[PDB]
Amino acid sequence: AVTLHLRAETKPLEARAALTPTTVKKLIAKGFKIYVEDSPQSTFNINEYRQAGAIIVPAGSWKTAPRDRIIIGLKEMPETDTFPLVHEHIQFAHCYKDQAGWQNVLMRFIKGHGTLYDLEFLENDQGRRVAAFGFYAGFAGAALGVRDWAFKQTHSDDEDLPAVSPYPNEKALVKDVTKDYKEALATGARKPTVLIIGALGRSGSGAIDLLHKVGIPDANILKWDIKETSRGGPFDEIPQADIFINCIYLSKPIAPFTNMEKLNNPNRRLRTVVDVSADTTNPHNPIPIYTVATVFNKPTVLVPTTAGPKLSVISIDHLPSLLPREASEFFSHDLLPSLELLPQRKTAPVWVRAKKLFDRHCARV
Amino acid sequence: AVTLHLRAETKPLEARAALTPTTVKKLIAKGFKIYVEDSPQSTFNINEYRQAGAIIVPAGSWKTAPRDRIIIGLKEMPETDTFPLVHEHIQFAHCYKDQAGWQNVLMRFIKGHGTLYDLEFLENDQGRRVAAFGFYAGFAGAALGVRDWAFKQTHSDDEDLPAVSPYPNEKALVKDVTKDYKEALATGARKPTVLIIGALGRSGSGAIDLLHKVGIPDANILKWDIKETSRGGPFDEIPQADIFINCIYLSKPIAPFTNMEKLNNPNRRLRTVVDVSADTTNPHNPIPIYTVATVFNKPTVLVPTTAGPKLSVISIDHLPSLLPREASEFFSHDLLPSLELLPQRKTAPVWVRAKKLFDRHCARV
Ligand SMILES: NC(=O)c1ccc[n+]([C@@H]2O[C@H](COP(=O)([O-])OP(=O)(O)OC[C@H]3O[C@@H](n4cnc5c(N)ncnc54)[C@H](O)[C@@H]3O)[C@@H](O)[C@H]2O)c1
Ligand SMILES: NC(=O)c1ccc[n+]([C@@H]2O[C@H](COP(=O)([O-])OP(=O)(O)OC[C@H]3O[C@@H](n4cnc5c(N)ncnc54)[C@H](O)[C@@H]3O)[C@@H](O)[C@H]2O)c1
Ligand SMILES: [Cl-]
Numbered sequence: 001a002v003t004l005h006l007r008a009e010t011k012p013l014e015a016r017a018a019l020t021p022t023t024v025k026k027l028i029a030k031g032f033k034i035y036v037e038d039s040p041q042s043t044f045n046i047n048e049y050r051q052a053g054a055i056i057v058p059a060g061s062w063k064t065a066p067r068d069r070i071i072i073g074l075k076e077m078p079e080t081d082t083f084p085l086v087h088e089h090i091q092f093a094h095c096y097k098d099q100a101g102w103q104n105v106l107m108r109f110i111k112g113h114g115t116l117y118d119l120e121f122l123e124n125d126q127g128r129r130v131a132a133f134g135f136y137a138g139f140a141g142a143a144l145g146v147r148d149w150a151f152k153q154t155h156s157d158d159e160d161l162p163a164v165s166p167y168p169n170e171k172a173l174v175k176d177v178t179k180d181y182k183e184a185l186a187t188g189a190r191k192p193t194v195l196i197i198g199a200l201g202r203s204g205s206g207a208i209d210l211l212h213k214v215g216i217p218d219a220n221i222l223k224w225d226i227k228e229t230s231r232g233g234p235f236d237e238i239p240q241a242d243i244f245i246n247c248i249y250l251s252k253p254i255a256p257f258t259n260m261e262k263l264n265n266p267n268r269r270l271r272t273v274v275d276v277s278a279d280t281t282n283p284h285n286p287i288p289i290y291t292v293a294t295v296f297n298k299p300t301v302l303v304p305t306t307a308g309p310k311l312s313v314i315s316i317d318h319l320p321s322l323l324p325r326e327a328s329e330f331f332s333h334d335l336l337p338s339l340e341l342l343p344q345r346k347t348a349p350v351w352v353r354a355k356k357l358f359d360r361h362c363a364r365v
Numbered sequence: 366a367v368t369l370h371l372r373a374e375t376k377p378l379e380a381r382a383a384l385t386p387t388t389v390k391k392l393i394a395k396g397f398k399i400y401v402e403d404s405p406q407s408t409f410n411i412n413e414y415r416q417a418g419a420i421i422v423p424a425g426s427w428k429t430a431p432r433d434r435i436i437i438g439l440k441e442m443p444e445t446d447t448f449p450l451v452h453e454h455i456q457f458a459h460c461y462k463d464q465a466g467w468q469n470v471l472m473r474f475i476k477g478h479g480t481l482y483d484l485e486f487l488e489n490d491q492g493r494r495v496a497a498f499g500f501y502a503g504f505a506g507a508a509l510g511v512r513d514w515a516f517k518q519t520h521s522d523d524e525d526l527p528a529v530s531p532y533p534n535e536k537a538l539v540k541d542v543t544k545d546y547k548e549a550l551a552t553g554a555r556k557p558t559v560l561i562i563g564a565l566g567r568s569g570s571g572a573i574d575l576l577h578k579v580g581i582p583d584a585n586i587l588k589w590d591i592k593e594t595s596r597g598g599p600f601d602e603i604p605q606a607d608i609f610i611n612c613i614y615l616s617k618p619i620a621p622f623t624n625m626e627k628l629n630n631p632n633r634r635l636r637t638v639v640d641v642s643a644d645t646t647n648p649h650n651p652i653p654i655y656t657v658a659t660v661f662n663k664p665t666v667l668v669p670t671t672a673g674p675k676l677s678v679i680s681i682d683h684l685p686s687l688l689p690r691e692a693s694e695f696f697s698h699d700l701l702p703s704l705e706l707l708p709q710r711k712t713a714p715v716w717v718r719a720k721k722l723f724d725r726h727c728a729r730v
Binding site for chain 1: 565588593715
């Protein structure tokens with residue numbers, strides 16, 4: 001009879017939810033009791049949770065909720081808040097990797113006799129995260145990649161892709177990319193060849209998924225993972241592709257995929273780099289041709305080349321925000337097996353690892 | 366505007382389908398035209414396919430269907446069919462690994478100018494299968510493993526687990542297993558510990574799923590993969606578990622996981638071994654404790670031991686046939702993205718690889 005209480009998000013702009021109406025309903029089928037906070041920034045209507053069996057409660061009511069409820073939320077809590085945290089919480093606390101005030105954070109739990117299970121460290125036994133936002137970052141990344149290539153075909157070099165905003169569902173995004181894509185083809189541009197390094201992961205998968213839905217031929221989509229890069233870069237297949245999408249979780253050092261001298265070639269076809277990895281400050285960044293982390297309001301940045309057509313990078317570090325409903329559905333569904341195991345949290349190693357990680361980190365203050 | 370024609374299976378006791386009413390409905394929405402044969406032996410009611418929007422046609426219609434329709438089936442043609450095969454066919458034809466009659470099968474295509482796209486060699490660019498039957502193999506294996514362990518609590522050593530028969534659905538199989546599991550716990554047996562090697566793969570995840578659905582604590586389920594076995598065998602944890610489920614894909618020699626010397630021990634708790642891999646014939650076999658390939662009517666074989674309690678092996682090589690419905694849903698769902706590229710089969714690499722494989726084996730006659 002586990003009880004869960006979905007905290008409304010307070011980080012501004014944040015529209016994703018850690019439980020969606022669909023998983024709330026699955027959870028109720030399993031005998032969970034579920035409270036959901038009314039949150040007007042959430043991309044899900046409160047009515048959808050109500051049809052699903054949720055008990056609707058006011059925003060912020062977690063604070064005064066009985067200490068049997070598990071508080072589940074997605075992003076970290078207000079800085080303004082300094083009161084002791086008494087419940088077990090599930091959330092991204094962003095305090096395990098020395099982000100300043102991480103001690104304040106843990107202090108509030110220590111003083112409350114409260115527990116943090118950190119979404120970011122829910123792993124299976126082999127070290128893979130159970131729930132991440134990969135797919136839709138890759139999906140959204142690819143989609144702006146296409147809109148950027150398309151914009152370069154229909155507008156002069158001195159206009160940049162304008163400021164982009166989130167979409168209420170996937171079908172609305174695909175229609176808009178599709179429209180821009182068809183406009184590009186009317187100018188006589190060749191359909192893009194799109195190179196994806198790291199294609200077998202979550203984001204690679206989403207990228208590929210977007211491209212199909214948009215209508216780029218399958219043979220136009222090159223799908224590289226470990227074995228295709230193993231010789232080491234730079235790779236000639238990068239300047240030659242129209243769009244290059246870097247998905248990939250960087251760990252090892254690794255040689256660069258491409259560099260300024262290979263890209264300064266008047267035979268270069270590459271219009272658009274979409275760095276889903278966005279490991280820009282890393283000293284082994286496989287694509288060191290840019291520095292700016294782009295954002296929604298300014299989604300692309302020029303790569304100053306001496307030769308070839310105008311080349312731009314997308315390096316948004318918050319891509320799944322483009323599609324909050326779908327990023328929330330896939331993530332909640334990724335999380336749900338482990339949620340089903342909350343009645344066993346005191347012995348299930350997914351939950352025990354996360355409690356021990358918490359223990360290890362409190363010992364550090 | 367592809368047309369697909371779902372052929373009725375003729376292989377004795379084959380109840381699965383390559384397309385389910387559910388993927389038919391998704392394919393129709395992408396603008397495919399789908400005809401479904403009305404099947405005596407299929408686990409789906411023809412109404413389900415009719416209400417998904419298939420056109421219903423008699424058994425055997427594919428034989429004279431126009432050559433615009435792609436004929437999709439699951440298993441092999443009757444050995445006794447000799448007429449020329451004129452269509453594009455998608456199925457498991459089993460003639461690429463030199464099975465007796467492989468030329469005869471190919472000859473039927475050569476005489477007819479047909480084309481085989483073999484379901485078994487449908488793979489991505491990194492050489493991994495797009496669609497296999499792993500999950501419900503592991504799920505059905507685990508059910509049978511838990512049901513054997515339990516039988517050994519409630520019955521005597523001279524009795525073996527009774528013959529099993531396909532189930533109409535998951536819930537039914539789960540209700541049986543749960544009941545037998547509940548009775549076994551009344552005898553004061555310890556909740557079993559189940560070790561799964563190959564846990565991360567398709568069959569591993571199926572095995573984990575069943576175990577959860579029957580209420581085996583997550584902490585009792587030891588989920589091992591490539592990392593956990595690198596030190597190499599034998600492994601002391603195998604004799605110490607109640608149940609061991611081998612879900613590995615075996616691709617090179619590796620030291621055995623266990624052996625009779627280690628099994629021949631007063632202290633051993635291991636009661637039931639489920640070899641889902643069922644690589645009995647292979648020299649690399651990592652559990653060579655048994656020689657017999659068990660079957661539904663006789664699903665365990667005795668392992669003779671000189672010490673410890675009664676031990677059995679389950680080595681059924683057609684586990685997915687016990688849940689033909691679910692097995693079909695999961696297969697058809699995995700194959701679905703590939704079926705969506707059929708308009709592009711002449712250039713989509715996944716299909717071009719299969720056409721290429723076919724032209725290679727044809728040249729061989
Ligand atoms: N920009 C964003 O908004 C955003 C959002 C979420 C995640 N991410 C980031 O995206 C990256 C990947 O996410 P993911 O979930 O898809 O990881 P993932 O593990 O699922 O995929 C990583 C893939 O890249 C492959 N790979 C690793 N190194 C490689 C190399 N040298 N050459 C070729 N292939 C290689 C891996 O084998 C794997 O298939 C991570 O850095 C993640 O933090 C970014
Ligand atoms: N018995 C049946 O009815 C039936 C039906 C389908 C498949 N299978 C068999 O199932 C086996 C696996 O099927 P799958 O779809 O789960 O394969 P899979 O590739 O999806 O997963 C195989 C897993 O084994 C792991 N692994 C490989 N070698 C290992 C080792 N030495 N130690 C530990 N882990 C190892 C891999 O990392 C992978 O996670 C295959 O041999 C297939 O032939 C049997
Ligand atoms: Cl073209």
